[PDB]
Structures are given as C-alpha cells and as structure tokens.
Amino acid sequence: GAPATVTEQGEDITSKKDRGVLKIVKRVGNGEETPMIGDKVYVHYKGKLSNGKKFDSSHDRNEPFVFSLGKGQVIKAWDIGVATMKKGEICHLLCKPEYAYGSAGSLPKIPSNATLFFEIELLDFKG
Numbered sequence: 001g002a003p004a005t006v007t008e009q010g011e012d013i014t015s016k017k018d019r020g021v022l023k024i025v026k027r028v029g030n031g032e033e034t035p036m037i038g039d040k041v042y043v044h045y046k047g048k049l050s051n052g053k054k055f056d057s058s059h060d061r062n063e064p065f066v067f068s069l070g071k072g073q074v075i076k077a078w079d080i081g082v083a084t085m086k087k088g089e090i091c092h093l094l095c096k097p098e099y100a101y102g103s104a105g106s107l108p109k110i111p112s113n114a115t116l117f118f119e120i121e122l123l124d125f126k127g
C-alpha cells in the first residue's frame with residue numbers, strides 16, 4: 001500500500017540525510033515557490049500508524065489544519081516536509097519517530113516509537 005511504497009520508494013528530504021523523512025510527490029503543485037518560515041499554511045491531511053489505523057484526518061473534520069511554518073507547532077517532519085511543497089501539491093511523507101513523537105508517543109492514539117505515514121495537500125500559504 002501507500003505506506004510501504006513511500007518507505008521503499010521515497011526520497012530522503014532531511015538535512016542530516018538520515019532517512020528520517022521520506023517523500024513522494026503525488027500531485028505536482030503550482031510554480032516553483034514553497035512557503036517560508038512563519039507563513040500561515042493551510043493543509044488537508046490524513047495520518048496512519050504502522051498498524052494501519054488512521055489516527056487523524058482533516059477531511060473528516062471538514063476544516064483544514066492551519067499552522068505557522070517552521071515554529072515547532074507540528075512535528076519536525078511536517079515543518080521539514082511542508083516547507084518543500086508547492087501550493088496545490090499533494091505528497092506522502094514517511095516519518096520516523098525521531099521526526100515525529102519519539103519514544104514518548106502522544107496519548108491516546110500515537111504509540112511509543114511510531115513511524116507515521118501522512119498524505120498532505122498544501123492548500124495555501126500566506127505571510
């Protein structure tokens with residue numbers, strides 16, 4: 001499935017090149033510009049655990065998730081991953097725990113040492 005495919009066929013987008021965050025672009029977005037640090041970014045997404053369970057989805061909430069890029073308001077993999085996206089892009093990210101919730105996890109839904117899968121759509125970004 002999609003998690004396996006990004007695990008096996010994704011590109012390492014980390015600065016450390018430690019394969020902690022792997023990406024596949026599913027839909028190419030618009031132009032060349034990506035958001036900048038501090039921008040208000042609007043995304044639709046779903047997240048799955050390695051046991052197949054969907055632990056989060058903005059589509060299911062009928063509202064985008066909104067955050068300021070690069071401020072640690074989201075897991076490291078998102079600050080890194082979303083920063084690589086063009087407006088309109090859809091990508092898959094495979095995030096190892098060191099770029100997600102680590103050994104702590106996030107009660108109740110994210111276990112310790114969890115590798116996470118996301119599909120993310122960048123809807124808009126604004127300074």
Ligand SMILES: O=[N+]([O-])c1ccc(O)cc1
Pocket residue numbers: 056065073074075078
């Ligand atoms: O990926 N993330 O950092 C998130 C995004 C939204 C949420 O409700 C929880 C975690």
